Each structure stands twice: as C-alpha cells, then as structure tokens.
Design a protein around this ligand. Structure first.
Ligand SMILES: Cc1cc(C)nc(SCC(=O)Nc2cccc(COc3cccc(NC(=O)c4cnn(C)c4)c3)c2)n1
Ligand SMILES: [Zn+2]
Length: 288
C-alpha cells in the first residue's frame, strides 16, 4: 500500500535502501537511466542546454528525404571513446549479484552493453546506435555499429548492400513510435519489481518518465541524480521524498557515479566495483 500501510524501507535514506536491498524482501531491481549516467563518460546530454529548423535533424520524415545533415551531425558528435561509468558497472554488479531484473535506458550510446549488460537485460526505450537497419520494409538488412561507424567517418551516406536503400541507426527519431519491446517488457516487469533505481534522468520525457507510476505502491524508489526529479508538477504516482506522507521514495543528490559508489560501499561492494571498473577501463584503454 501507500503511506497508510507499513513501509518496506526502515528509513528513507541511502542507508535504508541498502539494508532493504540485502534483505530477503528485495530480489528484483529495475533501473531507469538517462543521459545523466553517461556525462561523466564524456557523452553530453544533448538536452542539457550547456551542450529549415533545428528540430529537422531528428525528424524521421526529413531524414528519409535528406539524411546528410543527420549523418554529418553524427560524425561531429561521435564519442572519441566508449568507456562506461561507475554507474554503468554498478548495474553490471547488480546483474552479477542476481538482483537485476531490467535496465530501461533513454540513452543511445551503447555504454550499457559495453559495461556487460546483455540484450535480455536491456530495454533501450529510445533505441540505440548499436544496430542499424535498411529502411526498406521488404529488406530491413541489419548492420553493426562497426559498419555504420565507417560510413559516418568516411562521410558516405550509408546505403544497403542488398537494395541500396538508406540505412538508419536504430534510434527513435521524432515521428517514430517507441519500440514494441518497451511496452511489452513494461507490462511484465513492473509486476515483479522490488526496487526502482532511477539514475541520471530528470523524468521529463514521455512515455519513459511515466514508468515510475507503473511500480506497485509498496515498491521503494531511489533517485540518484544531480537534482530532485519525478515529483508531480504543481501546475500540470509522482515521487514524494519530503512530505509527511513520504514512505518509499529516497533522493540522493549528486553525481551518479558518486551516489552509486556510496551505495556500493554500504553494500560491501566497493572493492568489487573498484576492481571491475579498473579492469574494464584498462581493457578499453588498451584496445589496439
Ligand atoms: C554518433 C554516435 C554514436 C554512438 C554509438 N553514440 C553516440 S552518443 C552521442 C550523441 O549524442 N549522438 C547523437 C547524434 C545525433 C542525435 C542525437 C540525439 O538526438 C536525437 C536523434 C534522433 C532521435 C532522437 N529522439 C529521441 O530521443 C526520442 C524519440 N522519441 N522520444 C520519446 C524520445 C533524438 C545524438 N553517438
Ligand atoms: Zn536493403
């Protein structure tokens, strides 16, 4: 139930969340993540202002007629390295610890995959650069990012080797529906969740943001983010961190990496997280 029933967290703190996680009551964790978890990897949040019309470059209709702008922008914005953050590897540890039900991400940078989350673990709600497809319905040939990368840097508009149609990265352009997988997984996963871990998202983009309202009423929800988010808009279920009726929502405010480190430390996972990150970062740095 809500604030009227006995709550699962013994206190509304990171410390309370850690005790809950290591209790028998917490078995399945859903992570909801956004651009905030990749900024420390040197991937800007293109929605953060600090990072025909400008909106045309993401519209599917305009893209299919005039793809050159998008791919030009793709070359400029292409990350120089793909080194996932502490936050990403924290989710890998959740997976290793047998706690990860699913990671729903708004990001298209593939860092979840690089950090060791598998396709089954992931719902890429806004799509991904990881794969691309020929746009012709009768073909739909799939191309890997290695192939798409070469096209982007060579400044060759990617065309299908089978039919010479345009090849589009599997990101959701404006005008496109979210993937069916998003809705199918949402329907099953939120029946099963013991803990929501919301990291690096302001929960302002729909329908992704509405996911927090899909949790059972008893399910604790931990926000790790630079700013509080998810609270109902006074003008326009929602997060309640601070009222007298607060019973399950906890906000840890700071960088996602530092919050995840703090949580790992409480869990006795800090050494494991340190070792995993330094090993994987070393491996990525040593790619030849
Ligand atoms: C080029 C590249 C390659 C790889 C592997 N990673 C990157 S990450 C860096 C970067 O910013 N890459 C990059 C390059 C171009 C555009 C965008 C982001 O802007 C877009 C583009 C297309 C669609 C959308 N749409 C949505 O997000 C959406 C749609 N519906 N809803 C509800 C939301 C946004 C990001 N970049
Ligand atoms: Zn084709």
């Amino acid at each position: 139930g809500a604030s009227g029933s006995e709550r699962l967290l013994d206190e509304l703190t990171l410390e309370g969340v850690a005790r809950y996680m290591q209790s028998e009551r917490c078995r399945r964790v859903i992570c909801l993540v956004g651009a905030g978890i990749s900024t420390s990897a040197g991937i800007p949040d293109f929605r953060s202002p600090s990072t025909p019309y400008p909106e045309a470059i993401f519209e599917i209709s305009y893209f299919k007629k005039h793809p050159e702008p998008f791919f030009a922008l793709a070359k400029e914005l292409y990350p120089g390295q793909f080194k996932p953050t502490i936050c990403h590897y924290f989710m890998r540890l959740l997976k290793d610890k047998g706690l990860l039900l699913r990671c729903y991400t708004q990001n298209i940078d593939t860092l979840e995959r690089i950090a060791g989350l598998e396709q089954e673990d992931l719902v890429e709600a806004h799509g991904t650069f990881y794969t691309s497809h020929c746009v012709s319905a009768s073909c739909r040939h799939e191309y890997p990012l290695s192939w798409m990368k070469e096209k982007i840097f060579s400044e060759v508009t990617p065309k299908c080797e089978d039919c010479q149609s345009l090849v589009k990265p599997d990101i959701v352009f404006f005008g496109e529906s979210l993937p069916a997988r998003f809705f199918s997984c949402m329907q099953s996963d939120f029946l099963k969740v013991d803990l929501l871990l919301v990291m690096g998202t302001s929960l302002q983009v729909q329908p992704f943001a509405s996911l927090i309202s899909k949790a059972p009423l008893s399910t604790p929800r931990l926000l790790i983010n630079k700013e509080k988010a998810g609270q109902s808009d006074p003008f326009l279920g929602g997060m309640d961190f601070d009222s007298k009726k607060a019973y399950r929502d906890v906000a840890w405010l700071g960088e996602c990496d530092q919050g995840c480190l703090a949580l790992a430390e409480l869990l006795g996972w800090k050494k494991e997280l340190e070792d995993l990150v330094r090993r994987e970062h070393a491996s990525i740095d040593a790619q030849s």
